[PDB]
Amino acid sequence: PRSLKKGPFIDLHLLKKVEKAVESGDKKPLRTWSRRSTIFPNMIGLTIAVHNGRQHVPVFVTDEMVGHKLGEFAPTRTYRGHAA
């Protein structure tokens, strides 16, 4: 994990979008490619559409998700089993 002294990494464009969306009522999802950003407390209640490689998966942010990276909630591989 990222060193504690560096703090939590979030992409600047996503931080700006989240500040804008918290400041003006809950809008449509936040379309983002920043799977690598940390989920901040000020995203709770927002719906964030995280790219998985092909699509933007909706992620409703709850408190239990805080501190995780957004890509943790948008699986990138499709697998339903072999011999199926």
């Binding site: 239990e64 998700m65 995780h68 943790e72 909630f73 699986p75 072999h82 011999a83």
Partner: protein, 115 residues
């Protein structure tokens, strides 16, 4: 003998015997005994009731046994309930820490299941 709700081996050295508690390894065993003023090569049988009580008092400082078990179960349930990558890996009984699954992964997957 009876510490943290469990019986500790009576014939082993105290260091080894305390690692029978769920949540006590070798380092925590040394720490407990050095905080209770008891030599590590002392067999549990060669211990006064009062010294066993001191040992019990020092074990209650660490989360062990059923408290530790439900902590771990809560952490895994939280992962599974969130639906994060690690939660899905726990659900499907696959390695959670990035290991290859093309081969190996038998510890998580269990015995080979032929087609």
């Amino acid at each position: 003998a009876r510490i943290a709700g469990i019986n500790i081996p009576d014939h082993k050295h105290a260091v080894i015997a305390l690692t029978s508690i769920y949540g006590v390894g070798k380092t925590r065993s040394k720490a407990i005994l050095a905080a209770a003023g008891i030599a590590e090569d002392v067999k549990i049988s060669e211990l006064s009731e009062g010294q066993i009580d001191t040992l019990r008092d020092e074990v209650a400082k660490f989360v062990v046994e059923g408290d530790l078990r439900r902590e771990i179960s809560m952490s895994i349930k939280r992962l599974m309930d969130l639906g994060c990558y690690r939660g899905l890996r726990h659900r499907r009984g696959l390695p959670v820490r990035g290991q290859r699954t093309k081969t190996n992964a038998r510890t998580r997957k269990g015995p080979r299941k032929p087609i």
